[PDB]
What we know:
The chain is mainly alpha-helical. The chain has one domain (about 1-90). The chain is built from five helices and three strands. A hairpin with a 6-residue loop joins strand 1 (about 35-40) and strand 2. The termini are far apart. This is Baculoviral IAP repeat-containing protein 2.
Amino acid sequence: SISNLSMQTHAARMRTFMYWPSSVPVQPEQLASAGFYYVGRNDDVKCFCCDGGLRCWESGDDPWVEHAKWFPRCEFLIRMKGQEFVDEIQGR
Ligand SMILES: [Zn+2]
């Protein structure tokens, strides 16, 4: 089931990044697209579906690749990217 139903829509997730720190090299649009919303502390984000949390984002980090690497069984990630994409990331 969905861990945080209130954050299931892209527009609700985007609102959470209003005060996302400027020096973070990963943008709200990319994080929100991958299911992540900002919890309001440093650069901590969580997936609305699996509740997986990620922080300390680096330049070049791809939110979809990170979602597949750390949280492969997420239903949202599998529905958006497909099991084939997840399997490829998991295999590397
Ligand atoms: Zn997830």
